[PDB]
Each structure stands twice: as structure tokens, then as C-alpha cells.
Symmetry: C3
């Protein structure tokens, strides 16, 4: 027996719950296991879109040895804090993908990714901890994505790009391909704004916007 959850019942979670149901009901063929929301804003349990929603204290109290959680909180500092709590409490991180999520050859993705509908992860990609790939995003050939990276919808991450930990890539941003000799790097904790057209390396902690991308 198993219990599943989506951690976060705000916009991120409510748009991922249908995806977690595709993952569980169709890709895993599991019509038996319950799935709930976890949200620490809750005191008493409520329902959100027809699913039971409870705080983490209550979720921990459930008498099941086999818990699986997708963290659906876009802020990567919160996501890392929750992931470390879950692992310490002996709860499994759970990767979810949609029926229309395309995974190509020789792809490695660490546990706990949220891979939305219409996402492509192309050939020979490596992805670290609790990746968020929102609707329509792609990661093309030979990319290396670090830990707690977050893509908004419709990110175009071309080939030979290395995105370091905790970077955020905004809606519809486009990133030029690197080369095998010079991968294009997005630095640790960088923020690439909605619609940015990135043609060069982004420094760690930089915020870049515009076409072409410039420091904000």
C-alpha cells in the first residue's frame, strides 16, 4: 500500500495535481492509492478541487510506511527545505510527468521532478534534484541541469546549456545553444526574466531581462 501527495495547494500545486493523477492512475496504473494535498497554511483539513488537503503534521501522522510526495512550490529555497525535511522523515520524493511529457534517450532525472504536460527532455540530458519544468518547456541535447532549478512555462533551453543550482528561467525565455567545447552557463541562483533572449553566459546571482538579455 502507498499514499501520494502534492505539497503546495496554491497555483503551482493545483495545476500539477492533474499531472500527478496522470502519473499515478495511468503511467503507474495505480487506481488504489490515495493522493492528497499537503499545505502548511492549513490548520483543519479542507478539500481543494475535490482532494483532501492537510498540513504536514497531519500527513506525517498517516499510518503508512510508503509515502511519495511531489513538491509543487516554485520557490526553490522552499522546495529544498521541504525536500530535506521529507527525506529526513523517511518520505520518498516522487517524480511526476504528464501523458504528453516526452523523455528521449539516455536521460537522467533525480527524484522529485515536476515535469508538466507538453514538456520535452531531449537526448543525453542530466537533471538534478526537484526540477520544475512547467508547461511546454524543453531541455535539449547534452544539457546539465543542477539542483532545485525552476522553469516557468514555455522555456526554450537549447542544447549544450549548463544551468547551475537554484536558477529560475521565466516564461517564454529563449537560451542560445552552447557548443561541446563551451557550454553556455546559467550561473547559480540566476534569474532569467519572462521573454528574455539569452545569447551569452549569465553570471551567478544575475537578473537578466530583454531582447537581447541585459542585467536588470
Amino acid at each position: 500500500s502507498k499514499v501520494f501527495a502534492v505539497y503546495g495547494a496554491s497555483g503551482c500545486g493545483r495545476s500539477l495535481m492533474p499531472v500527478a493523477n496522470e502519473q499515478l492512475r495511468i503511467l503507474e496504473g495505480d487506481t488504489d492509492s490515495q493522493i492528497v494535498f499537503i499545505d502548511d497554511a492549513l490548520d483543519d483539513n479542507i478539500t481543494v478541487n475535490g482532494y483532501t488537503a492537510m498540513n504536514y503534521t497531519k500527513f506525517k501522522s498517516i499510518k503508512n510506511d510508503d509515502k511519495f510526495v511531489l513538491i509543487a512550490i516554485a520557490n526553490s529555497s522552499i522546495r529544498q527545505k521541504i525536500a530535506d525535511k521529507l527525506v529526513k522523515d523517511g518520505i520518498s520524493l516522487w517524480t511526476v510527468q504528464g501523458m504528453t511529457t516526452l523523455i528521449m534517450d539516455e536521460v537522467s532525472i533525480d527524484a522529485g521532478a515536476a515535469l508538466s504536460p507538453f514538456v520535452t527532455i531531449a537526448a543525453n540530458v542530466t537533471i538534478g534534484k526537484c526540477f520544475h519544468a512547467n508547461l511546454y518547456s524543453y531541455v535539449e541535447h547534452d544539457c546539465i541541469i543542477g539542483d532545485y532549478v525552476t522553469f516557468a512555462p514555455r522555456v526554450s533551453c537549447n542544447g549544450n546549456i549548463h544551468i547551475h543550482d537554484h536558477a529560475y528561467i521565466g516564461t517564454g525565455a529563449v537560451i542560445k545553444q552552447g557548443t561541446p567545447d563551451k557550454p553556455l552557463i546559467i550561473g547559480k541562483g540566476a534569474i532569467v526574466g519572462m521573454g528574455a533572449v539569452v545569447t551569452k553566459e549569465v553570471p551567478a546571482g544575475a537578473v537578466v531581462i530583454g531582447n537581447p538579455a541585459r542585467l536588470l
Copy 2:
């Protein structure tokens, strides 16, 4: 018995007819009902892409009590005029979606929407009359879309956005999310240009272009 139609046999209609066939043949499981084009440019009936095409006078003359029409005319002033005519003539407005159109939880969409392939309508969205969501568009969580709104392909409408009646959002435009306390408003009859990167409220009747969006 029933008769279906796509109103408009120009580019909008010809790219929606396959979608109307997915809706009718697959999602409704109806291999019996006829589907035609209506276009008022026609005097004599013709064929368009292998479908009978006739003017509205001829469509009205068909002896069937049960007519269903998708209005495939992007201009929302024309669309409203035709919708009001159809309803007055006792003809039903007909929502169409593709096999790859994704509808999430607690979504309300008024009759007569054209929801293209690869469209996502995410959690807790409300949409008014004869919405057009062209190919690849999305409407994310908690949005409220009014009546006779029109999206070009690949619109990224993020969460907590309120788009008022008759707005037009151009190809690949990106709109920043609102918050629950302050939804980002696109005003009545506003035009958001192809590729616009919208980070603030757009006034009613404004035309905005660019990255970032500015008045044209």
C-alpha cells in the same frame, strides 16, 4: 439526428475544421452527423478541403431541429454578431477542443469556444462566450476570461490574470502572473501585440507592443 458546422471557411475555419472533426468523431464518438462550413462570401455551395461549404441562408434552410455551430472567425465583433444571430435562430453554439487540448480541474467555459490543439486550460479557470484559444495557448490557474476574447497561437497567459471582453492577445505574447490580492487586468478591447512581454495592467482599448510592452 444533428448537423454541425464551422462558421468561416478562411484561415481560422480551415485550421479549426480538423479540430471540430476530432471533437465530433472522437470526443463525442459521432461518426453519423454531417459537418459543413458556413461562409457568407458564398452564393452557390462549393467544397472547401472536401467539406460542403454554404452560406448562412442555406444552412438555416436545412431541415434539422438540432444544429451546432463553432464560430471560426477571429474578429470578435463579427463573432459576437454571428453568435447573437445563431442563438436568435435557435441554433446551438458548439465548443470544440482537440485530442491534445488539456482541461484541468474546476474549469468553466461558456458554449462556443474554439480550443485548438496543444492548448492548456489550467486549474480553477473561468472563461466567457466564444473564446478563441489558438494553437499552443494556455490559460493558467485562477484566470477569469470575459466574452469574445481572442488568443493568437502560443499565448502564455499566466495565473491570476483577468482579461476583459473583446481583448485580443497576439502570437507568442507573454503576460506576467497577477496575485490573489491584485489580478493583472487586460482591459476591454485591448490589443496585445505579437511577442509583447506584458508586466503591468493594460488599459481598456490600449494597443501594447514590445519587450517590455509599451503603448504603440
Copy 3:
């Protein structure tokens, strides 16, 4: 009996091989025919992502009268040179599409196209030799695409656009629709940059970037 290949084992080929397997195993229902990579960088055969990879000399030497090749090299000058070699050696050019590639009514596409996942080719489109439509691209109604045209991912080619031979359209570029009286032309060998917002005719051999597009 038949032998298939993807010509190019670099990023283009490695992200198309899964698509060629969808085309062959599912759309053609062929679980018998072998598929390999061809790459002229190879001296001795190797494996790439679990597929045999050989140079063209070795592929020619295979004793099969019935060879089918998808050219997965984005550079259109190389693609034309290889296509002419294949045809002269009595090898067939092979169109590939994905399970999520949508083709609408009255579409004509010459042999050897690479039509990626999530691509739409809309109504009444004509496409010439060895077209590349990378992930998420669309070609809308009434377009005429010439020979050896190349789209990066997420190109938005709206209706009534004529793209002449060897043009390249970069990631996420958006092109305004033409009209029936005045198709919007992208000239021979033009380059439209990543993220460009094209609102006017692009001259032959021009390089255009930005929002709005300007000469680079």
C-alpha cells in the same frame, strides 16, 4: 526488407532518433526493419544511444536494395549536398514525424522532412525538400515553404507566409501573417534570429534580430 537511418549523430540526430523510431515502429507499424545512425566523423562503427552508428561508406556497403534516410543535419547547405548524394546512390529520402505531430487538411510535404514532436502543419500548406520543423514549431494556413528550410524549436510561422529556399528561422521567432493579396516573404537564405518578432518582408540573405526585427 528495408534499412532505415538517421544521417547525423550529433545533437540534431540524437534528438530526432526517437522521432524516427515513432515514425517506423508506430506510424509505419514496422518492428522488423533495422535503424542506424550515419555519421561521416566515424571511421570504425560505434554505438550512439544504443544504436549502431557508421559512416556513409559503410552504409552504402549494406546489401539491401531498400534504404530510407532522414537527414538530421540542421545546416541546410550540408543537408542539400547529402540529399543529392543519397538520391544519386538510389537511396530514398524518408519523412519522419512524431506521434504528437499534427498534420491538417490538404498538406503537401516533399520527402525527407524532419517533423518533430508537438509540430503543427496547418491547412493548405505546401513544403519543399528536406524541411526541418524542430520541436513545437508550426506552419499555419496557406504557407508555401521552399527547399531546405530550417526551423529551430518553437517557430510561430503564421498564415500566408512564403519562406524561400535555405532560410533559417531561430528559436521562438514569431512571424506576422501575410494576406492572400500580399503573402509575407522570407527571402532565400535569410536568417531570422532567436526571439525575432518579424512584422515585414525579410530580404534574401538578410540577418534580422530583435523586437521588432531589424537588420543585424
